[PDB]
């Protein structure tokens, strides 16, 4: 016999933080002896 109006809220996730990782800097940041062996693989960081 009588009515009103109710309001509701809803959130849907759409975006995401674009995370970029420097594989060479993460493994062999400032060590040349580390890079001399990380370049022996290379393709791991490349694919990452």
């Amino acid at each position: 016999t009588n009515f009103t109006i109710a309001g509701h809220e809803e959130f849907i996730q759409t975006s995401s933080p674009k995370v970029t990782i420097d594989c060479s800097a993460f493994v062999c940041s400032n060590y040349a002896a580390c890079h001399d062996l990380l370049s022996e693989y290379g393709t791991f960081c490349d694919n990452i």
């Binding site: 420097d22 060479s24 800097a25 940041s29 400032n30």
Partner: protein, 49 residues
């Protein structure tokens, strides 16, 4: 591109001066040579060598 690091501009070196010598040669060249059954031990700390 690949990462980089800022190159150092100077060098910091800190040591404690006025320290006596360890004198390990006076302990190794001692006339009293022990045996493996009663081997001796001497600890050297706070000295220069």
């Amino acid at each position: 591109l690949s990462g980089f690091t800022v190159k150092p501009v100077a060098t910091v070196y800190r040591r404690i001066p006025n320290l006596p010598d360890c004198d390990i040669d006076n302990w190794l060249n001692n006339v009293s040579v022990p045996s493996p059954l009663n081997w001796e031990r001497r600890i050297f700390s706070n000295c220069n060598f």
